[PDB]
Design a protein around this ligand. Structure first.
Ligand SMILES: *NCCCCCCCC
Length: 18
């Protein structure tokens, strides 16, 4: 179904690497 795709990442409230 509807998806952009990636083998990585998670929509956390913050980022400190990406
Ligand atoms: N269609 C959303 C799920 C797949 C992409 C986002 C998570 C990838 C680790």
């Amino acid at each position: 179904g509807s998806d952009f795709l990636s083998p990585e990442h998670q929509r956390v409230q913050q980022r400190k690497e990406s």
